[PDB]
Symmetry: D2
Subunit: 231 residues, 4 copies
Amino acid sequence: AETVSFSWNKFVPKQPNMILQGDAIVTSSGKLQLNKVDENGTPKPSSLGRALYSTPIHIWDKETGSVASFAASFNFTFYAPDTKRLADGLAFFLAPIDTKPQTHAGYLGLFNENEQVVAVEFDTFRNSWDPPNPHIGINVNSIRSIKTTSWDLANNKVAKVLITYDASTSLLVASLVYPSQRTSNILSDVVDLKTSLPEWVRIGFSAATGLDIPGESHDVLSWSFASNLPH
Amino acid sequence: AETVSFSWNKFVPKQPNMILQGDAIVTSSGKLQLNKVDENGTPKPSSLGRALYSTPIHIWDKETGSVASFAASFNFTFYAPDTKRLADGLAFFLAPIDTKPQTHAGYLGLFNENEQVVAVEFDTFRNSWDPPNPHIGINVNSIRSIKTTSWDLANNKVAKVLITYDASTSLLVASLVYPSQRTSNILSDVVDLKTSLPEWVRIGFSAATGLDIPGESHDVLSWSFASNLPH
Amino acid sequence: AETVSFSWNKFVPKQPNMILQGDAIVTSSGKLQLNKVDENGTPKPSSLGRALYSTPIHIWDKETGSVASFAASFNFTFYAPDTKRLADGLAFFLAPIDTKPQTHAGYLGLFNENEQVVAVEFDTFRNSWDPPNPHIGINVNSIRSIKTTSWDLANNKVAKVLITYDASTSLLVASLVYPSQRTSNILSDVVDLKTSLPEWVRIGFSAATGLDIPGESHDVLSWSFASNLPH
Amino acid sequence: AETVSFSWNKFVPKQPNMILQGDAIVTSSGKLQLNKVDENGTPKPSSLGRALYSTPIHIWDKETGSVASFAASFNFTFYAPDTKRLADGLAFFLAPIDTKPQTHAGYLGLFNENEQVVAVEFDTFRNSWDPPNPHIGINVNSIRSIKTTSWDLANNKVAKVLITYDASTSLLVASLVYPSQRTSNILSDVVDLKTSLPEWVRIGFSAATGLDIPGESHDVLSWSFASNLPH
Ligand SMILES: *[C@@H]1O[C@H](CO)[C@@H](O)[C@H](O)[C@H]1NC(C)=O
Ligand SMILES: *[C@@H]1O[C@H](CO)[C@@H](O)[C@H](O)[C@H]1NC(C)=O
Ligand SMILES: *[C@@H]1O[C@H](CO)[C@@H](O)[C@H](O)[C@H]1NC(C)=O
Ligand SMILES: *[C@@H]1O[C@H](CO)[C@@H](O)[C@H](O)[C@H]1NC(C)=O
Ligand SMILES: [Ca+2]
Ligand SMILES: [Ca+2]
Ligand SMILES: [Ca+2]
Ligand SMILES: [Ca+2]
Ligand SMILES: [Mn+2]
Ligand SMILES: [Mn+2]
Ligand SMILES: [Mn+2]
Ligand SMILES: [Mn+2]
């Protein structure tokens, strides 16, 4: 019966418990910038960042056949100079220890244009596989989400997000909420970890600006997470 | 900095920590029946039950001006012999210590046809003030909800529900989920406790069958809850 | 799998979640006075107070045979005008719902000079059954402790106390610590709840001044507690 | 306000969240062997192991001046073929990220015969600086403990240990308990982290067999730990 939890209400520059990738960095202001931006703070096209959590997570044990439940929360934001021309998006995810980045822009640095990753996307941009309108999605080893739901996204406003995975029912659930606007979104579906990730994994976020365009920055303010893996 | 939490995965007949009201009782089977039903288990019109939690909850302190945050979860179900003719509904709520029941049927035993109660309704029945289709609602000292959202309800299937109240932003958030169906609903809005309940309160559920008709039973399987009231 | 927890860092006058008995009251200053004292704050002989916690605790279930584990912490103090002439003591305890007080002075209001109570005593006074020097003791249905250990008590100084009961090993453990003095005491022994209390109980403290003399007041500053009762 | 916690009831061979050093390894049997032993399981003189926890711990922040509180628990054991001739001991500790081992035998791999380490020792062996009889000690940047207390140690029997550090009072407290024997030991003292470790640290255990002799193996069965570092 293994557990773990952590939580921060700010990010400390150069925390040794974290791992930055791509343009992803930790402002002194405490924010987690994953995207590169102008002196003017303008997001910079073809930008890319990821950020993982040092300790790896024992998602599930093969001996016991046990699968864990975890939940994670965090508040992110996005800045976008032209709310008409948006992209590319943000994700939270579970990968394996060795995970380096991947395709930028529409692949949210998670998938490859070509080719054991699970995640929740906050997609700003209508790709070919994307449905209409910024949505939220569950990605199971694929940028084409198993299920989606509009995301009543809102520029510059903060959003609290909560993600849960119930081993018992095998149900990832994600809800995003915008206190500023008193609006809210939720999504749910089954996901079989036992067959989509390694007995151990590392979690983190990923985020991408557009190619042709800047789109929107993506900074994360806080993160908490916990897991129980039963005997 | 006051806190409290409890949680049960079943109900024990005659738990001294609880309080039954109306037809509300605790089956040996461990369920929390709030409605009276046939030998055949058929809900029985004009039925009514409530069930409160012994210890009262210090929702907020006037000296300090502090307001608490709490969250509560629980899984309920409903049985309805004629999925066409449904009613009347279920609620979870915060009232003051002395709260006895009130109007039955459409008033979900919470309000009076006439006349400091806050709650979340899972309304099966279209009253006059009700919108169309079973919804979910936030009730603030009134059976006419401040905001609502369809409830993709489903007979006989179990639903996990989670309710949160963030003092900081003053935002009650409710999400109901039906793992069986992989569907999900969420609702959010601000609620000022400081002006809608007493420094201390008691929480519990309430549930009602129809007048003219039976409608649907309402049993609750589990309950967990916690609160922090800061210094 | 039933749980419960609460914690306060101060006492609120007239908390509806608590129960006072005897002279036990809640100063505005936030302290929990269990003993009556002078305008000068001088403890008043033959004084007596208890204070219980509203919600009852399901210590153990007969159907399942399950026994719970709990731990409790709290910081108390004692004021004693004549550190030479001390008494009578303080206790923390588990009794059954209906528990009213009992013998004063040396019986710490827990036992009767004559005659299902479990507790930990912080004895200031050498009774006949008492060993030498203020000690700490485990009382199992009897003022004559099953085991004891000196208590390097210290007037007017605050003491943090922690009590644990491990169902698995059936071991109550108590440790008292005096940060002020960087000193510390610990005691341990087995206790069979299953045969010394009711499936349900209520917990609280009890405290007594001397007969012939005042001895020492006993106020409690904070209290936290938790319990898991497994399936 | 940063926190973290983890806990395991067994050790998984080759957990990527841990770090072995010296002879320290993880038996398949789930135990954490820190010492090398015979095919017969006989401890092997001049043996040495340490084991650290992957994620580093932000013990305290210089900007804020904040210091954290943590507590840790774990159950260890020791096997010793000749209960007359014992050594060398075991420790739990906080060091800085880069910590590799150090002096063996009496230095419990923590200190150097010569020369920012804080720890609690379970010393089997009377060095020169050691007091009489296996004790427990608080080591602050030195194998000569700031304070000690006998350890009513017991061969082959399991011991539950609990360590707490209260930032507020700056008091490390350690209590060791032997349910098997219903005995118990406790130690307490102030320790200024702010001046004895780095803003960030890594924790783990260390353990040593004797030089001339085998003494006693040292395996650890379980570990839990948590920390809050306030804003
Ligand atoms: C999200 O977290 C940030 C940083 O911890 C905080 O300043 C902000 O107000 C938070 N927003 C919500 C909605 O909790
Ligand atoms: C809800 O709780 C009940 C009783 O604790 C349990 O048997 C049922 O499977 C639960 N359903 C979900 C979706 O967790
Ligand atoms: C004990 O609790 C009181 C009241 O909460 C506090 O003011 C006091 O400083 C505490 N002492 C210790 C040693 O924690
Ligand atoms: C200590 O932990 C081990 C492994 O988790 C367990 O098997 C053993 O019985 C425990 N002993 C105590 C006293 O809790
Ligand atoms: Ca896209
Ligand atoms: Ca209605
Ligand atoms: Ca006595
Ligand atoms: Ca030594
Ligand atoms: Mn998509
Ligand atoms: Mn309604
Ligand atoms: Mn005694
Ligand atoms: Mn020593």
